[PDB]
């Protein structure tokens, strides 16, 4: 895709410095290659590395990246629609995954707190129940919203131990 220049950053696809970066790396690869005869396995490995570099640079060109004066891609994280894949979408993926991990943990700690000996189950994890809670934590945002609305997400002030101050 063709992205508009933003914050004084030209698109990497049409950036001469991006082409120079690609060129330089590829030439370095060639130099590394030259000492190896083509039949030997390092020669093929280096040619595959060159291919990988070319397709990486091409993919970065097409992915609507903005490059700077240095010639390397720069991320726009202000929320711009043209660069949402830089931070927003992977940000949403992280927020979903991290909240899943945390909610699986919270659910297991609350469930194990009802056991006869909670601290032993804290180190010897009940794998079937654990996995059940882990897969139930797929709908973490919903269940967290329910806990927030019902007031059971947060313990009241009086129950929590505090310093004498």
């Amino acid at each position: 895709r063709d992205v508009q220049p933003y914050a004084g950053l030209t698109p990497c696809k049409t950036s001469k410095a991006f082409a120079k970066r690609e060129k330089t790396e590829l030439k370095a690869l060639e130099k590394r290659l030259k000492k190896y005869d083509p039949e030997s396995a390092p020669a093929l490995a280096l040619q595959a590395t060159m291919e990988k570099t070319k397709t990486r640079f091409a993919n970065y060109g097409e992915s609507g990246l903005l490059c700077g004066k240095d010639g390397l891609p720069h991320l726009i994280v202000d929320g711009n629609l043209e660069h949402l894949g830089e931070f927003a979408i992977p940000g949403l993926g992280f927020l979903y995954v991290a909240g899943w991990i945390g909610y699986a943990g919270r659910s297991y700690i609350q469930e194990n707190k009802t056991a006869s000996k909670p601290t032993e189950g804290e180190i010897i994890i009940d794998v079937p129940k654990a996995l059940g809670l882990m897969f139930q934590a797929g709908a973490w945002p919903l269940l967290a919203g329910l806990e927030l609305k019902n007031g059971t997400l947060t313990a009241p002030e009086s129950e929590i131990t505090v310093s004498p101050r």
Partner: protein, 62 residues
């Protein structure tokens, strides 16, 4: 007999207590008019590793 019966959960009100604002089972209450008659047992240990100590009648709530 004065104070909480045995077996009930009492909320600690002593500010300096490790289990302040926490709940503990009453083991026994001394009726000989001692200053801290209420023996409260705690699931969780303090920094000294003990799970119980003594409280007055006004340092507990049930």
């Amino acid at each position: 007999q004065v104070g909480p019966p045995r077996g009930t959960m009492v909320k600690i009100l002593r500010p300096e207590s490790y289990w302040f604002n926490d709940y503990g089972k009453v083991i026994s209450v001394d009726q000989t008019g001692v200053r801290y008659p209420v023996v409260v047992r705690f699931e969780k240990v303090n920094y000294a590793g003990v799970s119980t100590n003594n409280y007055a009648l006004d340092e507990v709530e049930y």
